[PDB]
């Protein structure tokens, strides 16, 4: 065992949902005030890391039917790799209306949107964006964390690195 055992994803204070892409593998989406990736980097230095990254986000967009509007906006994002299993952390700026509106055309916002509409946990506020069905979602959560993990382990945070 390397370093000390990781905290739980499934907590009384967290909102979480699991997307099962593979036969038992998938993505654990966690909305938290707990930071998992402690650096400011997302180094996709090789084609494999870039490929693992695109597959993770493609999975979320496909499953949630995210039609993300082009607002030329971005979420603060860290990523790391642990033997082929990616971790993606969004430092969400959705705590205030103005902040949410400027980080509205993002995957993280699409996830927040699904959590709200599916009632998966947590309370949110929907701001009418400029276009159709897309809402800018407010949340008090600081982090959205996405980890490639198994169903047996989805309730515990994986090691980022």
Ligand X SMILES: *[C@@H]1O[C@H](CO)[C@@H](O[C@@H]2O[C@H](CO)[C@@H](O)[C@H](O)[C@H]2NC(C)=O)[C@H](O)[C@H]1NC(C)=O
Give me the phi and psi of 49, to 5 degrees please: -65, -35
Q: Does an H or E element contain 88, and which?
A: strand 85-91
Task: Tell me the per-residue interface mask from 6 to 35 with ligand X, x by CB under 6 A, - otherwise.
Answer: -----------------------------x
Radius of gyration of the chain (CA): 15
65 binds ligand X (CB under 6 A): no
Task: Find the part of the chain contacting ligand NAG (CB under 6 A) among 23-31, 39-47, 99-107, 112-120.
Answer: 23-31
Q: Considering the complex, state which of residue 27 and residue 77 has its C-beta at the smaller distance from ligand X.
A: 77
- Rounded to a whole number of angstroms, the minimum distance from the CB of residue 80 to ligand X is 6
Residue 85, contacted partner among ligand NAG, ligand X, none, CB below 5-8 A by kind? ligand NAG
Number of chain positions touching ligand NAG (CB under 6 A) = 15
Closer residue to ligand X in complex, CB, 39/131: 39
Residue 107 binding: pick among ligand X, ligand NAG, none (C-beta 5-8 Å cut-off by kind): none
Nearest by Cα to 60 from 44, 75, 41, 72: 75
Phi-psi region of 15 (alpha: psi -120 to 50; beta: other; left: phi over 0): beta
How far apart (Å, rounded) are the C-alpha atoms in residues 105 and 65? 14
What DSSP letter does each residue of 120-131 carry, written as one string? -SS--EEEE-SS
Torsion of CA 80, 119, 68, 18, to 10 degrees: 30
Candidates 8, 44, 61, 76; binder of ligand X (CB under 6 A) is 76
User: What SS3 state is found at 13?
Assistant: coil
Chain contacts with ligand NAG (rule: CB under 6 A): 13, 21-22, 25-27, 33, 55-56, 59, 84-85, 140, 142, 148
Chain contacts with ligand X (rule: CB under 6 A): 35, 38-41, 43, 76-78, 91
């Amino acid at each position: 065992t390397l370093n000390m055992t990781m905290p739980l994803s499934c907590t009384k204070n967290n909102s979480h949902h699991y997307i099962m892409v593979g036969n038992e593998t998938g993505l654990e989406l966690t909305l938290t005030n707990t930071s998992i990736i402690n650096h400011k980097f997302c180094n996709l230095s090789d084609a494999h890391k870039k490929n693992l990254y695109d597959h993770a986000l493609m999975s979320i967009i496909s499953t949630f039917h995210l039609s993300i509007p082009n607002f030329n906006q971005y979420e603060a994002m860290s990523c790391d790799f642990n033997g082929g299993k990616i971790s993606v952390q969004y430092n969400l700026s959705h705590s205030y209306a103005g902040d949410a509106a400027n980080h509205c055309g993002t995957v993280a916002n699409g996830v927040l949107q699904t959590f709200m509409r599916m009632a998966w946990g947590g309370s949110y506020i929907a701001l009418d964006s400029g276009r159709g069905n897309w809402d800018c979602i407010m949340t008090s959560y600081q982090y959205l964390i996405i980890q490639n993990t198994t169903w047996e382990d989805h309730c515990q945070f994986s090691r980022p690195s």
